[PDB]
């Protein structure tokens, strides 16, 4: 399990792997771990799937409920506070073993500079949150390898396509260096899913672009 | 870690994977686990590498020492007894965690029927040994998947090439179903190693044949 | 504690940090961890210093004793076997907490190709050894960060100076990403020590070259 | 984590480091640990960030709520009592491992002598509080080194700039003597944050002054 | 218990406190912890007295025995090795609770520069040794406070008297900041003992000089 | 921590030390441990400060509340019962480690003989109370030494000044024999605080008298 | 169990109680705990009687054996070393519960000043020894009370009778303050035993003198 | 702690010691343990004082409350039932260590024979009660010795004075045979307290009679 | 199990009960526990019978062996030392549960006064021994009751018959007060065994005298 997210001028990208493992045996091959909560942010949870899907659904439901009740969407700080409270409320279950660490990436429509409106937030096991400002952040088992790869590869990010390519390459490096992370599948045609958030909203990247990027990266590495 | 061995008319084949993992992180990519002790048998040990290489070297040294002292090679039963004693003498270290389960495949030159002279022997953690007679046997973490694949694929074994193809396909299935087993590497050009033992002795299969077999299997599975 | 070693055409380089920490408090600022055993190989041990210096001295003494007794130096395989036996004999003390993982880099004078005569060997806690062939290897607390940095930076290695620069940059990255690794000191003038082994023997890199390389890297990163 | 605070004629200064470490790996590089609750006092919490930010926000909210309800600000003794109750109410979580030790520095507008109106209060893990009167106090992992440095350097404090320089030098010494404390960053341009409280209220020290002070201290130490 | 030692041009000084405490109750008031082994070095052990006196006597006896047997005194490296072996041989008793950490200070008569012939060696609990080169080192319960005081006060060391004054001031600071360290006694006339080693040998500082230095320091601090 | 109290004809005196220690390190140098609850009695608590200040404040608040509600002050037996109930209600926290043993000294205005109206009450950890009648009582870590000193020195008590001198001498002896008790400070000018209760009420002894008494005692002991 | 010993001009006295208690029940009423080893020293052991008598007999036997073998008595330092070795050799039994702490008092015939030839040595549980120089020392359960009493009463010691009276008074105070120490028995006529060592040798004090001293002390205390 | 009670024609006597011990150290010298609940019975509790005084006060309060509510005193069986319920309700605290075993002695005014109206009741730790009919009963640490002494001495009981003398002698024997029981004090003038209950009610024995009885017993034993 | 022994002018008597109990069930009714080792002393062991008989036989064998080897009987001190060594050598088995506490009574033929030549020695579980001088001593489960009875009844001992009667009465009292001690049996005719030692040697008391004494005591108690 590895989820990466980096900031590019005018938006933010988010991607994750598609592998679920029960110990050392592979259980899933195309598991989806990146979800869209509402128009201008997406979340990704690494850990137990049973807690991850529940957290995603509950976060989306709470955001929609508040928006319907008050008539206006929550501010970014309010969303961060709600997610932090949700994470903190599961500390006992995390101690038992039901651990889920989410990653939040969104676009701030109430920012003076649209080019620097992208935000990346990481959460701790105890509920603490920190706003990422180095331009990238990764979570999961292979987070360290992906973070090092992004540290070296962030100099080539200029637009959305460059950021997507860097994210795919970081995921490939994490899968190469970690046995719990699943790389691109050229036999079954399974590729990581990505979400791009910009001023127009959050959209889902088509599988064709990710397939071409993965094929190009594999050819280059050969 | 997965090592497979099956019997074909006129000989016996033996193959294993090339992956070493320290927990969940990949440490090796072309680790060799199949060794040739003397002319008419080869061994393969799955488990801790530090114990596996030591066991292989010690077994070869003991066989050579006996052959030099007495002037004649040991019988197959004597070799099985020596290997069983060696395995039994390491039970305390196996209990602590230094476990090594070897697999023995050899050719009996003192058999009435040369076509049925192949032998496969499996060893337990307590030193018990059993002569395999179903025609195939696998050891390691992904032994069950490989054994099922060989159970379905043993009907197509007629000669050495068919047995080698079946072994490679079983290793591929085990790597597909197990995250601790490494499949063929089309980027770095790493392929499993195989040893063929027949009436002329034990030889090492060239990497080119294994590469072509793996490529054909991958193309067929696509 | 971080020690790195990579292979370049015609030799091999080896370097390590200069930090000793007692828990979370800094105890040493210029600790030397890379030692020269004899003419054509050098070793580096990461872990408890009391065991590291003892292991280095004992290995050098054993090599010199064998060379004096037999009149010829040991082969590389013999040196690897001796070091593996020494590491394996300390497993109980390592279990208690006195752990020391050495890294071996040397030059093989009995190789057909002088340009590919460099060797890098890594040792496990149980005494297992593996010959490194990816071109680089790192040990210590910050080994992962240095290994990722070398994975990205190995494409620029052409000669000794390039390899030394890559090693220094990898050490700098490891110190940046790890609080237990000490980076270059521009106030006290403390810089990591490096050893270069080639066909002419093993020599110690002067501090001036490492100082200039570290200053250039710091200026580039600014 | 290290937070220092000392008293100068006519006010009080407060500063802290910008390092967050998850065990031995660095997680944050510009973490803010000094916060302003209201006009005439500021607080600093060392320990778990998830508890520290919550404590700061809750203390500020409680003070504002009381001021709005009663129409007058709380006395200094009342603020100390409220903070002590808040600290005491978290003793079980501190026993489990969620420990947070705050440091309180403020200006008493109801004092006969304005020059001696500065107050420094330290809190224990059990909720006990003591008013600091030696002129300085430090909390965190590297509190001892900073306290010794301030013990030697307090003789040069005459005004606000002298106190700020002494605080920065004490933080530098603590970072030098402790691996968990982050010193000034000349590459990324990260410097410790400081807050100055005087008769006109609590203000935030601009980063430029701290940068010049740190550069001067580094040059002097060279 | 606190023992300090610092280097001055042309020699080395060594001093320690005179307090023995059984838990929280004071048992001794003039305990001697600095001993002279032979002509050109002195040792000081902090910890259990029953082990400290035994270690001092055994070290002196071993040095004298070697000098009598071989006719020449041991080199400094040999003395360090012997002391390290002695410390390492007591690791089990230290684990039970009989811990003794010695501090070694000596003068090297076989050095090119007489002004830089002073040496300070510190030993770890596991037997590891490191040659001190910052110019000072302290051991005992209040070692940190004394080390910080010496860090600030080392700039005034020019000769033997300055070094002695700095050592006495550091001991006074350690006694002030630590309840297990005994300061100067103006009622019973008990003062710390000091040993000065120079090119002429190791001598014992008379109590009168230490008394005057302590009185001057107390008057200055008033 | 040591608090002493003895009876003299016409009143009662009470005094305590000014040292707070966190294990073996000194944390406070002028901590106040003797408090005045109301007109005709004072209390002193030895142990955890966080519990001691809370107990003193709560006892004073309860006494004032009862006096305001009923219009008449509580009898001495009622005050003893209230304090015993308060002590008994904290037995679980004392078992965990939050132990606080108070000492009560007061003047009974409803006694037939004004000269024998002084009362001293000691409390146990389980809430039991006993009225002291030997003429003196001490509590704290160094209670035994102070009690022995008062046993020898009680023959010289004739009036208030004699009792104060005896109490100061007992505190000095306790500080001499105990490392957790702080004696008079001739450098920082810190002296123990004392409270005198007589027929006119409870008053605080000025620091000048205690300073002169301590100086005279120190001169006599020299 | 309480044994006291103090120094007077021209000799040294030693005395102990006569009570043995099995838990809380009295088992003995006239147990002797002070023994004479040879001419110029006597010893007293507090703790388990079965170990105490054995230690006394063994010490006397060893001293006599050495004197007979070498023809000259051991020096005082040699006797101290032998007793320390004997105490150290029983550390395991002391840990189990068979603890015996001896007290050594003797006269040095090889001293320049006969008036200051008295010596008092105390031993720790780990075998450490310290020469007493305050003029008095007590061991046993009620050692603290006796030591405080001697601290106050040492000013009246001028000769042997004064020292004996002070020792008897200290024993009486220890018995008064400790329930495990037996005071003088006026019904059965049991009184503590004392030994006086001077330039003429060690002699046993007659019971009549101790009886008169105890009666006078009891009458004075009435 | 020892409390004795025996029956004589026409009444019943009750007495107890005056010693309180905290482990092995004496804490009290004239502690009162025999109390009068109402006109025709008295109680004595041995064990923790904090529980003993509380039990005595609560029993007296309950008896007075019932007498005031119903207008008639409780029967003896009702009093026994109430005391048994009170003892049974404290079983958990007794299990923790807060054990208190009371002894009840009273006079039955509703009995046919006034000469045999005395009653002695003993209570167990579980709340069980038994009416004593052998003529005597003792409780406390030294209960066995006192019971044996009363077994031998009960033949001389004819009236109140004889019973009082027998009780005092039994207490003296218990104090002689037990170190936790305090005998008569001829120095401080402390003697055991006794209560005599007859047809006229319960009265307190004056100290003079007990003093004369103790002096006569001591003289006889001499 | 109860064994008693008391001293009378001109000799010493020794007696014990005849009951063996396995927990709470009676196993033996006439078990003999008093044995004669040699002419002038007898021993009695209380505890495990399997150890008691072995100890008696071994002690007798050792005494006879020494007497035969040297030609003269051992002194009383030598016998005490041998018995103490034998008891001390069984401390581990006693800790497991095989406890045996012997009682020694003998006649000293080498004493100046024949009337005071009787000796009684008691031994502890750790091997310590004490010579009894109060005139009586008892061991076993009911030792306390017998000792109290002898304390009251020792005033009537004038000769052998009086001592025997006192011993029988003490045994009867111990059996009455203890359920593990067997009293005289008037149905089966079982009575305690006694041994009388005087100047003429040790003899066994006939059962008729003990029967008459027990019958007289029973009649008197009726």
From Swiss-Prot, chains A, B, C, D, E, F, G, H, I:
Component of the proteasome core, a large protease complex with broad specificity involved in protein degradation. The M.tuberculosis proteasome is able to cleave oligopeptides not only after hydrophobic but also after basic, acidic and small neutral residues. In complex with the ATPase Mpa, degrades protein targets conjugated to a prokaryotic ubiquitin-like protein (Pup). Among the identified substrates of the M.tuberculosis proteasome are the pupylated FabD, PanB and Mpa proteins. In the course of search for new antibiotics, a class of oxathiazol-2-one compounds has been identified that selectively inhibits the M.tuberculosis proteasome over the human proteasome and that kills non-replicating M.tuberculosis. The record marks 1 as: Covalent link with the inhibitor MLN-273. The keyword Cytoplasm applies. The active site is at residue 1. One of its GO terms (molecular function) is threonine-type endopeptidase activity. The unprocessed form of PrcB is phosphorylated by PknA. Processing of PrcB is greatly retarded in the presence of H(2)O(2). This is Proteasome subunit beta. One of its GO terms (biological process) is modification-dependent protein catabolic process. Its main location: cytoplasm.
């Amino acid at each position: 399990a590895t989820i990466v997210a980096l900031k590019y001028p005018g938006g933010v990208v988010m991607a994750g792997d598609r592998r679920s493992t029960q110990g050392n045996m592979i259980s899933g091959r195309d598991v989806r771990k990146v979800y869209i909560t509402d128009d201008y942010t997406a979340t990704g949870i690494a850990g137990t799937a049973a807690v991850a899907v529940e957290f995603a659904r509950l976060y989306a439901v709470e955001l929609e409920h508040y928006e319907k009740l008050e008539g206006v969407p929550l501010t970014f700080a309010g969303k961060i506070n709600r997610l932090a409270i949700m994470v903190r409320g599961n500390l006992a279950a995390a101690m038992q073993g039901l651990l889920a660490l989410p990653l939040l990436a969104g676009y701030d429509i109430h920012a003076s500079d649209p080019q620097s409106a992208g935000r990346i937030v990481s959460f701790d096991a105890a509920g603490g949150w920190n706003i990422e400002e180095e331009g990238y952040q990764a979570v999961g088992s292979g987070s360290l390898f992906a973070k090092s790869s992004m540290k070296k590869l962030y100099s080539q990010v200029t637009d959305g396509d460059s950021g997507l390519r860097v994210a795919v390459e970081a995921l490939y490096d994490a899968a190469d260096d970690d046995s719990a992370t699943g790389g691109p599948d050229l036999v079954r045609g399974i590729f990581p899913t990505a979400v791009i958030i910009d001023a127009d909203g959050a959209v889902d990247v088509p599988e064709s672009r990710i397939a071409e990027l993965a094929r190009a990266i594999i050819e280059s590495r050969s």
